[PDB]
Amino acid sequence: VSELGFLCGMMRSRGLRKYIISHLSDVAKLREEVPAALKGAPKPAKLVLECIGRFFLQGSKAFGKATHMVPSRQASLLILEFFLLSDCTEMEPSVKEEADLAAVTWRKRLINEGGVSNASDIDARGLLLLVASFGIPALFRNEDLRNLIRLSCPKEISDALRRSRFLLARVPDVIQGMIKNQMNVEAVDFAYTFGLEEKFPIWKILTSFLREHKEEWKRTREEDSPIRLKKANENYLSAMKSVTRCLEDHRVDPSKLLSGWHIDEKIIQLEKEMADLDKKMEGK
Amino acid sequence: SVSELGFLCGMMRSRGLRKYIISHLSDVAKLREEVPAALKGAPKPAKLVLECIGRFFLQGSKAFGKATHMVPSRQASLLILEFFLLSDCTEMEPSVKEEADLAAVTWRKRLINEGGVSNASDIDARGLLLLVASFGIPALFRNEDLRNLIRLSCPKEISDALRRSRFLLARVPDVIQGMIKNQMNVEAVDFAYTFGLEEKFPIWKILTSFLREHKEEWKRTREEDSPIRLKKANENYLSAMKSVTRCLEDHRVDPSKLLSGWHIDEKIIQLEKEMADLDKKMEGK
Amino acid sequence: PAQTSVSELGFLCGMMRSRGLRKYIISHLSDVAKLREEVPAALKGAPKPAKLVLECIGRFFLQGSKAFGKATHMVPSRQASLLILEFFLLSDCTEMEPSVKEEADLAAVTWRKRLINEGGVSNASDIDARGLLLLVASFGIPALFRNEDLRNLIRLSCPKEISDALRRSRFLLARVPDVIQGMIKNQMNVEAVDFAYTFGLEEKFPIWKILTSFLREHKEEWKRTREEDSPIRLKKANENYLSAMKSVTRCLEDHRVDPSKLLSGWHIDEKIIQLEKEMADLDKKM
Secondary structure (H helix, E strand, O other), X not given: OOHHHHHHHHXXXXXXXXXXXXXXXXHHHHHHHHHHHHXXXXXXXXXXXXXXXXXXXXXXXXXXXXXXXXXXXXXXXXXXXXXXXXXXXXXXXXXXXXXXXXXXXXXXXXXXXXXXXXOXXXXXXXXXXXXXXXXXXXXXOHHHHHHHHHHOOOOOOHHHHOOOOOHHHXXXXXXXXXXXXXXXXXHHHXXXXXXXXXXXXXHHHHHHHHHHHHHHHHHOOOOOOHHHHHHHXXXXXXXXXXXXXXXXXXXXXXXXXXXXXXXXXXXHHHHHHHHHHHHOOOOO | OHHHHHHHHHOOOHHXXXXXXXXXXXXXHHXXXXXXXXXXXXXXXXXXXXXXXXXXXXXXXXXXXXXXXXXXXXXXXXXXXXXXHHOOOOOOOHHHHHHHHHHXXXXXXXXHXXXXXXXXXXXXXXXXXXXXXXHOOOOOOOHHHHHHHHHHOOHHHHHHHHOOOOOHXXXXXXXXXXXXXXXXXXXXXXXXXXXXXXXXXXHXXXXXXXXXXXXXXXXXXXXXXXHHHHHHHHHHXXXXXXXXXXXXXXXXXXXXXXXXXXXXXXXXXXXXXXHHHHXXXXXXX | OHHHHOOHHHHHHXXXXXXXXXXHHHHOOOOHHHHHHHHHHHHHOOOOHHHHHHHHHOHHHHOOOOOOOOOOOOOHHHHHHHHHHHHHHOOOOOOOOHHHHHHHHHHHHHHHHHHHHOOOOOOOOHHHHHHHHHHHHHHOOOOOOOHHHHHHHHHHOOHHHHHHHHOOOOOXXXXXXXXXXXXXXXXXXXXXHHHHXXXXXXXXXXXXXXXXXXXXXXXXXXXXXXXXXXXXHHHHXXXXXXXXXXXXXHHXXXXXXXXXXXXXXXXXXXXXXXXXXXXXXHHHOO
């Protein structure tokens, strides 16, 4: 059997690191065979945890570090994904407690760098992947996880993300939070993104959203003053298109799920009324 | 050359114009010379330009390993908008106007959701600027928005293009006006000059008044027994002055003519000398 | 002409072509390890080294002239300017002309003024922070600079890589203490220790009273949390303490101090494995 097996069963951290960093020319192959080999190894949770890196949870890094992705960081991200998607419940409490402190220290770091809200694509998806694989620190707030998911560009990460089971347990909880906060559309996004549609009244959430904005839009109806009229029109349309995109992103046809709002039609109506409203601004 | 393009625009072929423009990124210059020309010949050029930028603009640049630097998908979009401003083509259908209007409202909303317009890529800022510049400015756009867009877009290299809008020309005056009152003066003049509005603005009054205020606040804290307070008020003053000299020089205005009176390079040497003085005298240790 | 008996670096420095030195450095950027041994040398072989590096930084550095499309991925110009500032701190050139000092001083001033108009110094490119810190470290800290500004530059700067060159300052070595005494009074402990270690000033500060006041206020908070109602509030207070420790640990291992030797009598090495074992306990029992 080919070298990757040799690596895994022989438990060589930096060997595997170098190996992947080496095969980066075609990542496809790595997706196919890496998580395979990882199963054929002796206690893979700790292989992957040692295999991770220091500068990753360490107090700040590199130089051109933020918003780039050098092959060190990359190899470690990718290992995390591959380990998620190799499907192993294997880790014993040593590995767990460690990966836990890891994520905690990491979060502290990000919180100092200005909060989790401002964080790198690389950092966010990094801690997401981390915690996702080894479990979520008690300390982590919900809003934190929200921000991680938000920043990580989680969609091209979905398959491997929804394999999580630490994530799968905690995420619904965090979406409920978002739902209670007027963050409707985004909650529908998170839900759809993890394969959690089943656990949220989605049709309800979107419908409520649209309704509230319909009422806001009616609220300012005769303001005279054409500009307030146009402003509230733009706002409403934006909300519509907002739901429109969230849905078609996930391959949901709003002409069906929200059929009965006749969104396409209300959009043409609002835009026509807007051009009308513009002819009534300049001279004639 | 004018034929690939006179076909492309005559024949209203969107994906074609874009692929062309992406192809000829090698020489961008002659691209800038031929395209706005070609664009006058399109049947409904507004429409063609909207079709030309499409969605990947307003939603894009989310590619993972970061460095918001510029791929030639976005590049071509910027290019098409500039050329479309240069074509002096106008009076688009109200259909395209409102579509592009919504596009802008949405793009802005995104920018806000991402931490504000104040922090936005040069590419996002310039893109949204060029969008509104061409197809009009949505109601929801706040003056301070326009101000940051212009600020972040490096408008100097876009200037003559920006200068053709009439959307930015009806609105930009209100913006420089508001910027004088809230005290932005040096930048209000930078904008003024950038759009070729120096006529409609008392530039001398504004720069001058700015320097006045700094000269006085330079005197509040002036003569008393405080090498530190001295050097400090000195640096504030120096810097406001260099702010004026760089701003005028950027527009190839001689500050030693237009702001002569006020001899600046002079006051700057006097002040940097005074400073070195205090730097030798502050020793005491 | 046996004038070719000198080096190209040497010629470039002696002849004082800012532009030429920049182009040269930009071009040899492939190998920076060589430039680090060669340039600080050739630098003292110039008529006026400070005016030359100031000429070399260029308008484009401080002014906030950044290539439109490009990311800070280094239009190599910026890489070069940071490298020149660095190599000139490394060249042990003192005695600069006061014209150049107050010019550079003004540059550092307008740089800051700009950083502030951009959302504050606190948010800064790693590039900007390193650049300004190097600037000030070579030509002196201006009046207007507050200690806070300085802290953020030092922190945001990734100093540990730049520390050898950073340690030659004396504009820095003179101010750093005032800044650290500031940070200690601010409850900044592990990080103020981190600064004092990076600037060579470990000896001039109560490292022990610091790392201690910290680890003890953090045991005192965590004893208050050994009761009161939850296995979750327990794992919380517990990861809290465990982090604070692991941070003192990583801080000293960074600077090649032994966590034990400096703090031993704590046995934070034992305490770590004790609280890890203890949340593996609270992990099975939840």
